[PDB]
Design an enzyme around this catalytic site. Sequence first.
Site, PDB file in Angstrom:
ATOM      1  CG  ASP A 132      -2.252   0.642   0.980  1.00  7.87           C
ATOM      2  OD1 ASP A 132      -2.271   1.879   0.961  1.00  7.87           O
ATOM      3  OD2 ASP A 132      -3.290  -0.043   0.834  1.00  7.87           O
ATOM      4  CG  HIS A 163      -5.349   3.815   1.290  1.00  9.38           C
ATOM      5  ND1 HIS A 163      -4.834   2.611   0.864  1.00  9.38           N
ATOM      6  CD2 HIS A 163      -6.655   3.812   0.930  1.00  9.38           C
ATOM      7  CE1 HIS A 163      -5.793   1.899   0.292  1.00  9.38           C
ATOM      8  NE2 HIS A 163      -6.907   2.606   0.321  1.00  9.38           N
ATOM      9  CG  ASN A 185     -13.709   1.248  -3.665  1.00  7.17           C
ATOM     10  OD1 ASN A 185     -14.077   0.249  -3.053  1.00  7.17           O
ATOM     11  ND2 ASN A 185     -12.580   1.885  -3.375  1.00  7.17           N
ATOM     12  CB  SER A 202      -9.217   0.304   0.684  1.00 11.34           C
ATOM     13  OG  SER A 202      -8.807   0.589  -0.629  1.00 11.34           O
TER      14      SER A 202
END
Length: 279
Positions: free
Chosen positions: A39, A69, A161, A224
């Site tokens: 990530d 994130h 998403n 996520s």
Amino acid sequence: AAQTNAPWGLARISSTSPGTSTYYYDESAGQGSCVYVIDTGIEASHPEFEGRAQMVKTYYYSSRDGNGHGTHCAGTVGSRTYGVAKKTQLFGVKVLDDNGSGQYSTIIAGMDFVASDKNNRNCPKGVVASLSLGGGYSSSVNSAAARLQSSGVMVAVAAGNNNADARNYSPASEPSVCTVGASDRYDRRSSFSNYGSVLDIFGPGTDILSTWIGGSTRSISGTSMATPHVAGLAAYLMTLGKTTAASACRYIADTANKGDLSNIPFGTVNLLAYNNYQA
């Protein structure tokens, strides 16, 4: 073990019903397992990680998470308050820049890095990788995810998403990895969650409280956020000896809460991750 006033997602994964607020789990808590969070990085100094997090690789000028994130995802895997597997070891691999973006070639390199690097780590209970990232369909990206899985790592990836069929996204569309959709606290498919036959499981993804950079916390939403619930669950189940890296996605699907989610399109699994912990 019981954690009172837990984030709703933690309570959900140890419950046969929505609407509760205590997380129940075996005290082994993923001890002896490892989870790689591939990530934007992990703020390992966050008190919530208790020294159990570390950066192991970056492809940029720093290994620091300048975004948040990655730290949020890692918190859902393994932070003391916000995590599923509260005693796992967390390894950060920064394939995404501080704007949350990364070239597919860098992402691929990070996956192959984990497949090798696990041989440099002590993970007697097993190894998991959490990939809260993706893009358009790429056979090369899917193949990298497949290699990582083949190498003996439980790979959990975000479905995406777009409120669309995940068949058109990578690594979501790779059949051999665990593709994770998102749900909300009322057991509805999250509004943004991708769907489709390639999904293997749903996890909590709407309004998920976890760690953030600057030693902080916040609530955000996405597939996520669902992905690290599943990655942490895998680590936890592997520590318990209930399953293995190669079989964990299937085991999670086998033991899921079935038929409880609303707005699941015909042909998409109606399975919600569940630890089946009996206190």
